[PDB]
Write a protein that binds this ligand. Structure first.
Ligand SMILES: O=c1ccn([C@@H]2O[C@H](COP(=O)(O)OP(=O)(O)O)[C@@H](O)[C@H]2O)c(=O)[nH]1
Ligand SMILES: O=c1ccn([C@@H]2O[C@H](COP(=O)(O)OP(=O)(O)O)[C@@H](O)[C@H]2O)c(=O)[nH]1
Ligand SMILES: [Mn+2]
Ligand SMILES: [Mn+2]
Lengths: 251, 251
């Protein structure tokens, strides 16, 4: 293995846990040589953690509601940010020298181990405001200091969008205008939100299921091998990995 | 003046001509020291050209249907690209050493003369596929050679999107991964297509009315000083410039 480097994701409940299982399975399918880590909350059932342990190398419990937790004081100032402050613990994983964070609503389509050639903070442009990076996929260097700086910003300013992206863009404010290599190609975080896709979509490495309805919210029908009601192949691939690679794992 | 440098736009009919008048007026309002040039087709009425001559320094006729025109042979190979091939004549303006091209559906909100500090090809990211630049605002160096290269590409490949953006991104294919200074801030070409706008929208320099319905397609009502049926201030500002600055110009 590479014990030094990891893909890291986050699950705060059993639903998003299904995303992480598909994500993690997709990274394994494409033969990552890196470690797979999921940050989990106590809202994730013990039974679902057990399933998570079959795909991830580490299942690391984070509970911001605990007074022992580093973020707990910040949560009391900003109680609307529990999920965000949990995600930012990704910077506390100081046993790793470099990590790629990935949202549980991502799916990997090709080997993306070359991301570890990048430096903090490397991320793809967000559609809709492309001078902000999308926080669903980013390369970072674990650090207690950086983590504590991020907590402080969250304390002072909250997030301009109620999630982690605002706060990450505010702290990492030089991304839009400094060093192009920190701009991940859009194909490493391709929002499922048209003629450009016909030309470039085939080279997609990561698809990101941005928005309200997540792939596990759909009703899957084995009879038709698809869901009840743009490029629907990605949603179908999600459920292929789920039914094929994930389902037989704890038995 | 600066006789060396110009803002350049394009009008193929009387409708888009109204956009160019508002654009040009907005550049004058914000006190550009550069020259204002509009490329016009014979589909633009002589009476509307006369109004255009009150705002622009040069009204340059381009007719791709003419056998004397440089693009005419390319048009016969690709007859669906008349508008595109007309726009690309912007590169034929070799009397200027550097130009900013702007679509007739842009409106300037602040002085953007600092764009002339940039080099070919400097453009803002397109929302939706942000590793392509949006072709509504770009800094370029006039050149017969570049122009002829662009014609050839148009001949060989057409455009992957039926307009000029595909062809410009294909020719200028290194934009996404080389030299960040060629990435215009999104505020220099802000698509009217939300929490990021609350934080960053106020610093907008150029708004771009992307999409089907253009500002002059709206019915303006002087009684209410707004239109019949997101951030509606931009559309209202368009019509303010039209009614205030443009309307009294030929009398
Ligand atoms: O209720 C939640 C909210 C978010 N997350 C995690 O935080 C990330 C960011 O949220 P989300 O992906 O739902 O936002 P979006 O990507 O749609 O903008 C998710 O991918 C998860 O890893 C989670 O586990 N549970
Ligand atoms: O019928 C047309 C089509 C386009 N154009 C010019 O070409 C540009 C690009 O087209 P458009 O702005 O309509 O495309 P969009 O910006 O909406 O994607 C316009 O701004 C105009 O300057 C024009 O004059 N007449
Ligand atoms: Mn996400
Ligand atoms: Mn336009």
């Amino acid at each position: 293995s590479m014990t030094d480097q990891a893909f890291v994701t986050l699950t705060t409940n059993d639903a998003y846990a299904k995303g992480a299982l598909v994500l993690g399975s997709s990274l394994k399918q494409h033969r990552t040589t890196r470690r797979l880590v999921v940050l989990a909350t106590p809202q994730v059932s013990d039974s679902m953690r057990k399933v998570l342990e079959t795909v991830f190398d580490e299942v690391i419990m984070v509970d911001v509601l605990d007074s022992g937790d580093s973020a707990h004081l910040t949560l009391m100032k900003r109680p609307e940010l529990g999920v965000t402050l949990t995600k930012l613990h990704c910077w506390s994983l100081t046993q790793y020298s470099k990590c790629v964070f990935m949202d549980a609503d991502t799916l990997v389509l090709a080997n993306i181990d070359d991301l570890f050639d990048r430096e903090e903070l490397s991320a793809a442009p967000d559609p809709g405001w492309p001078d902000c990076f999308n926080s669903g996929v980013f390369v970072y260097q674990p650090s207690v200091e950086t983590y504590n700086q991020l907590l402080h910003l969250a304390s002072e300013q909250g997030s301009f969008d109620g999630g982690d992206q605002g706060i990450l863009n505010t702290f990492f404010s030089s991304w839009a205008t400094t060093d192009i290599r920190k701009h991940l190609p859009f194909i490493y975080n391709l929002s499922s939100i048209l003629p450009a896709f016909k030309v470039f979509g085939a080279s997609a490495k990561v698809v990101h299921f941005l928005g309200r309805v997540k792939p596990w919210n759909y009703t899957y029908d084995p009879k038709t091998k698809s869901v009840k009601s743009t490029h629907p192949e990605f949603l179908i691939l999600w459920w292929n990995i789920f039914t094929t690679n994930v389902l037989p794992l704890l038995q």
